[PDB]
Amino acid sequence: DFNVKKLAADAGTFLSRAVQFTEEKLGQAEKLDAHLENLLSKAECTKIWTEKIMKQTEVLLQPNPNARIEEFVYEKLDRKAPSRINNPELLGQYMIDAGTEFGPGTAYGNALIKCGETQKRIGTADRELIQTSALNFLTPLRNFIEGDYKTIAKERKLLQNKRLDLDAAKTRLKEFDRQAEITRLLLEGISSTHAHHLRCLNDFVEAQMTYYAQCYQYMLDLQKQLGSFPSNYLSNNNQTSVT
Amino acid sequence: DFNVKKLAADAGTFLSRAVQFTEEKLGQAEKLDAHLENLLSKAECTKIWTEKIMKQTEVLLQPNPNARIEEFVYEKLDRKAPSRINNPELLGQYMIDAGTEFGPGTAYGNALIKCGETQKRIGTADRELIQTSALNFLTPLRNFIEGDYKTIAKERKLLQNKRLDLDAAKTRLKEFDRQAEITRLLLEGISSTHAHHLRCLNDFVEAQMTYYAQCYQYMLDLQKQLGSFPSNYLSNNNQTSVT
């Protein structure tokens, strides 16, 4: 009865320390009073959070910092680059050829090109889905990464550089005021004036959302375009079908 | 003016013969009169069409016979194998940790876990999407591949085997009737009695379709759960926001 005791005694420490082992892709700022160290740590969480949503919409598997390495490389122009081909275009690309190869004297000939044009028009919607996820969700946050975030990192880097310079200036008894003011104004801008990312998430969920209803209400029309075999080919003299 | 003539003269043959170069993964049956050779060729198109829809729903890129090689390997049991993790589970898996790491004294604390639980409940819907595409669309057609299609290929193989045997029996002048009857009944079963795949496509489009409306009408609720900042935090004394 002592093994299952000692088995839970050194496993509680392993279960308690299972958090601080991963989820790191950048450095850490210099350890300032709690009014400024809390703003600097909140800036570090704001940096890791603003640079950890854009890894999520392009690939479909993002549980790891490999998607953050995929996010750290960035692209501004879309020139000489087409859309990525999706599942519904390839779900109808063969079926067009299968419908013109199978046979026209059969009720599948009024049926396979209906599903083929259905999949080929969900193909343009999924071509739109990769564009509305990359133009209003990937683009302005990336331009804010290479915009004022370099200015914020520059002002806090010169803050942490010249803080030790004024430590050298004040500790010998007998560039930090203006730099700390611009840095603290940037930190209070990215904490208090945070009306930049509520709209980004609230428009990203609408940009994902307004494709699902369109392709659903277009796939509802396939039962109307395909409803002739429970009404006209149901009464066929060759075979009966499902009503 | 003769170069652009000859350039469009040898290129018409290349544009006319751009079809018969690919799209082949099995063999061809033996070349029988047109009432039986047309049924045998229709059986070959029925075989390539029935064995070329199941390659399309699992992977998202199927323009080539590599998806047909992925389709030729088949799996019956789902034992000791979980669901594949999708995009919305991984779209909220970090955001739960980001919400409990960022800060609770801010209106994002009433906002990030809302989007996180939204993405985590689209995660179960995309966990359902890989199951309704693999259980009612991949499973019974695969059981029909290793079911009566082996019987159809066996009866037509013995047809093409003993047809030359009765050619040997009849051409020397001075097992094919019953085999040809069972084979022709199987070919007329897979041509005329074709009420097996209208329901499969008509239920595959409903199985894809009834996820889109559910996740759309669940993402419409995020504007209601997130509508408190255009009504209560809009009148906040720190900052105004968007209405």
Swiss-Prot record, chains A, B:
Region (Required for membrane binding): 1-31
Subcellular localization: Cytoplasm; Golgi apparatus membrane; Mitochondrion outer membrane; Cytoplasmic vesicle, Autophagosome membrane
Membrane association type: Peripheral membrane protein
UniProt-recorded Gene Ontology molecular function terms: cadherin binding; fatty acid binding; identical protein binding; lysophosphatidic acid acyltransferase activity; phosphatidylinositol 3-kinase activator activity; protein homodimerization activity
UniProt PTM comment: Phosphorylated at Thr-139 by CDK5; this phosphorylation is required for autophagy induction in starved neurons and facilitates homodimerization.
Note: HeLa cells lacking SH3GLB1 show dissociation of outer and inner mitochondrial membrane as well as abnormal mitochondrial morphology. Cells overexpressing SH3GLB1 lacking an N-terminal amphipathic helix show a similar phenotype. SH3GLB1 binds liposomes and induces formation of tubules from liposomes. SH3GLB1 lacking the N-terminal amphipathic helix fails to induce liposome tubulation.
UniProt free text on domains: An N-terminal amphipathic helix, the BAR domain and a second amphipathic helix inserted into helix 1 of the BAR domain (N-BAR domain) induce membrane curvature and bind curved membranes.
Quaternary structure annotation from Swiss-Prot or TrEMBL: Homodimer, and heterodimer with SH3GLB2. Binds BAX; induction of apoptosis augments BAX binding. Binds DNM1, HTT, AMPH, BIN1 and ARFGAP1. Interacts with UVRAG; UVRAG bridges the interaction to BECN1 indicative for an association with the PI3K complex II (PI3KC3-C2).
Protein name per its UniProtKB record: Endophilin-B1
Lineage: Eukaryota, Metazoa, Chordata, Craniata, Vertebrata
Full protein: residues contained: 5 to 269 of 365
